[PDB]
Amino acid sequence: VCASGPRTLVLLDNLNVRETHSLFFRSLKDRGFELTFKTADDPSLSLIKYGEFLYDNLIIFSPSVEDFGGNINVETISAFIDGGGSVLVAASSDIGDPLRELGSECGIEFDEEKTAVIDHHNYDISDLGQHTLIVADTENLLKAPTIVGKSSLNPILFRGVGMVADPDNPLVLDILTGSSTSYSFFPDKPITQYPHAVGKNTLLIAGLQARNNARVIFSGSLDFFSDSFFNSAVQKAAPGSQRYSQTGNYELAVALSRWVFKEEGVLRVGPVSHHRVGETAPPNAYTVTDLVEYSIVIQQLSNGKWVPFDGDDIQLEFVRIDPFVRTFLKKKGGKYSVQFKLPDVYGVFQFKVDYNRLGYTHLYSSTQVSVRPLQHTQYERFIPSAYPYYASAFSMMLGLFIFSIVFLHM
Amino acid sequence: LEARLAHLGVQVKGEDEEENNLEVRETKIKGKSGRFFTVKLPVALDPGAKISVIVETVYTHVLHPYPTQITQSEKQ
Amino acid sequence: NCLMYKMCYYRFGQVYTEAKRPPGFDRVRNAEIGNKDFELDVLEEAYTTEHWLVRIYKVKDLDNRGLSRT
């Protein structure tokens, strides 16, 4: 089970992209995706027909295009993302305006056209003499093996347009920052203004995890995916630099493509159960200071198979407005469960589970639960501190009886 | 459609519509899937005779909106 | 610019409340409202009754992309 279907639309700006990227599309069709290749200018393009989506995934290898054909629009690609489709975008120095508008609607701000990422210290020896083919060190690669793959990677070659993640947007995934020395500017023209991006703020690859759990990756370089950089060796041009027999471009491209298309980090929430400990079923309402067991099952997509989740650190909350209790759910009996005593306070509480971890799917679960005060029958009875007060009334009624006996018959 | 058949009526071609209604019974033929109905004719049909009958049926829910959702200004 | 004023007078600014009065005349304040054209950003109009006597809005769910609503 791929958590999105195989139906994939490829948008190319020229058909020779299919020949020059053959290894990538081979390494994607071999996963069972069902590609179709269309020119991004083609008037027959559409994603929605009669309100249904015609494709489950979209790949926009169309950096230079000023407008999409047909009814494809940044408003339509926005509605596609809000529909839950996954999108892959590759820019370049040819970046056309609508890719910048799409970034602005995602919150990833591509620099101007003609701009490039520059790095005068880590440009590759193979650079054309402009110091814009940069060897991005894997020290910068995000610490998220679900995204970037669990194996080690040799340095990776990038050549493209830097982008800035808007600090206003919390969901943005800073996957591959530029070097501390790199920056983005017009390479020919002097630095009159302040750069758009400078230092480690420069992003080469950035991701998005939407609240509907849509995923988008914006790559700053198409060439990044090319067979040239897959086959090329790599060596920093400055002296004292090792030569690596192969770039890590390929394994990282595969791991990214697996992430985007919901092949890793997909999590599901199954049934949730709560009951009074020792009972088998939930009461309509719990009492103050009752003792309740809570159990949940969480599953993970592995090789397209759902399996019980491994994660250790899941936390339950018990919330009225602010959280009253927060505790780790223990992994027991194939389930996640905890036993705890309800707070001293009645109200309409909610159980929450909020397993938000980098690269994993945002899991949210909530069950509303009213906690009611004690019933009048449940109050404490025969309190031994009060025996004098019981013996008082059971003296008074006896005195009254004996008096009613004597008074009438004396 | 057999799941969605609301009504079936039959009548012989002829003006006495209130009386030309034929009697129909729901019937099952051995070994074959689907609902069947047996219609009793008013007079038997001889070898080389013929008769014209009119079958009228009404199905329900068989028109499905597509698209399933619209704004106020869109049509159905 | 408060929430209540924006909920009461949404679209109302274009209603011909009377024949002798300009559009957006308020029958109770006897005043032409000052801020006639605006968009609501975190509410969508769910139902306005025939005479607009009662208006109910749906508070928009959190923006899907993490953009800010401004």
From Swiss-Prot, chain A:
<dbReference type="GO" id="GO:0005783">
    <property type="term" value="C:endoplasmic reticulum"/>
</dbReference>
<dbReference type="GO" id="GO:0005886">
    <property type="term" value="C:plasma membrane"/>
</dbReference>
<dbReference type="GO" id="GO:0006487">
    <property type="term" value="P:protein N-linked glycosylation"/>
</dbReference>
<dbReference type="GO" id="GO:0006486">
    <property type="term" value="P:protein glycosylation"/>
</dbReference>
<keyword id="KW-1133">Transmembrane helix</keyword>
<dbReference type="GO" id="GO:0043231">
    <property type="term" value="C:intracellular membrane-bounded organelle"/>
</dbReference>
<dbReference type="InterPro" id="IPR055459">
    <property type="entry name" value="OST48_MD"/>
</dbReference>
<dbReference type="GO" id="GO:0042110">
    <property type="term" value="P:T cell activation"/>
</dbReference>
<protein>
    <recommendedName>
        <fullName>Dolichyl-diphosphooligosaccharide--protein glycosyltransferase 48 kDa subunit</fullName>
    </recommendedName>
</protein>
<feature type="transmembrane region" description="Helical">
    <location>
        <begin position="389"/>
        <end position="408"/>
    </location>
</feature>
<keyword id="KW-0472">Membrane</keyword>
<dbReference type="GO" id="GO:0016020">
    <property type="term" value="C:membrane"/>
</dbReference>
<keyword id="KW-0900">Congenital disorder of glycosylation</keyword>
<dbReference type="Pfam" id="PF03345">
    <property type="entry name" value="OST48_N"/>
</dbReference>
<dbReference type="Pfam" id="PF23358">
    <property type="entry name" value="OST48_MD"/>
</dbReference>
Curated annotation (Swiss-Prot), chain B:
<protein>
    <recommendedName>
        <fullName>Dolichyl-diphosphooligosaccharide--protein glycosyltransferase subunit 1</fullName>
    </recommendedName>
</protein>
<comment type="similarity">
    <text>Belongs to the OST1 family.</text>
</comment>
<comment type="function">
    <text>Subunit of the oligosaccharyl transferase (OST) complex that catalyzes the initial transfer of a defined glycan (Glc(3)Man(9)GlcNAc(2) in eukaryotes) from the lipid carrier dolichol-pyrophosphate to an asparagine residue within an Asn-X-Ser/Thr consensus motif in nascent polypeptide chains, the first step in protein N-glycosylation. N-glycosylation occurs cotranslationally and the complex associates with the Sec61 complex at the channel-forming translocon complex that mediates protein translocation across the endoplasmic reticulum (ER). All subunits are required for a maximal enzyme activity.</text>
</comment>
<comment type="subunit">
    <text>Component of the oligosaccharyltransferase (OST) complex. OST exists in two different complex forms which contain common core subunits RPN1, RPN2, OST48, OST4, DAD1 and TMEM258, either STT3A or STT3B as catalytic subunits, and form-specific accessory subunits. STT3A complex assembly occurs through the formation of 3 subcomplexes. Subcomplex 1 contains RPN1 and TMEM258, subcomplex 2 contains the STT3A-specific subunits STT3A, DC2/OSTC, and KCP2 as well as the core subunit OST4, and subcomplex 3 contains RPN2, DAD1, and OST48.</text>
</comment>
From Swiss-Prot, chain C:
<comment type="function">
    <text>Catalytic subunit of the oligosaccharyl transferase (OST) complex that catalyzes the initial transfer of a defined glycan (Glc(3)Man(9)GlcNAc(2) in eukaryotes) from the lipid carrier dolichol-pyrophosphate to an asparagine residue within an Asn-X-Ser/Thr consensus motif in nascent polypeptide chains, the first step in protein N-glycosylation. N-glycosylation occurs cotranslationally and the complex associates with the Sec61 complex at the channel-forming translocon complex that mediates protein translocation across the endoplasmic reticulum (ER).</text>
</comment>
<comment type="similarity">
    <text>Belongs to the STT3 family.</text>
</comment>
<comment type="subunit">
    <text>Component of the oligosaccharyltransferase (OST) complex. There are 2 OST complexes, OST-A and OST-B, which contain STT3A or STT3B as catalytic subunit, respectively. OST-A and OST-B contain common core subunits RPN1, RPN2, OST48, OST4, DAD1 and TMEM258, and OST-A contains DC2/OSTC and KRTCAP2/KCP2 specific accessory subunits. OST-A complex assembly occurs through the formation of 3 subcomplexes. Subcomplex 1 contains RPN1 and TMEM258, subcomplex 2 contains the OST-A-specific subunits STT3A, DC2/OSTC, and KCP2 as well as the core subunit OST4, and subcomplex 3 contains RPN2, DAD1, and OST48.</text>
</comment>
<protein>
    <recommendedName>
        <fullName>Dolichyl-diphosphooligosaccharide--protein glycosyltransferase subunit STT3A</fullName>
    </recommendedName>
</protein>
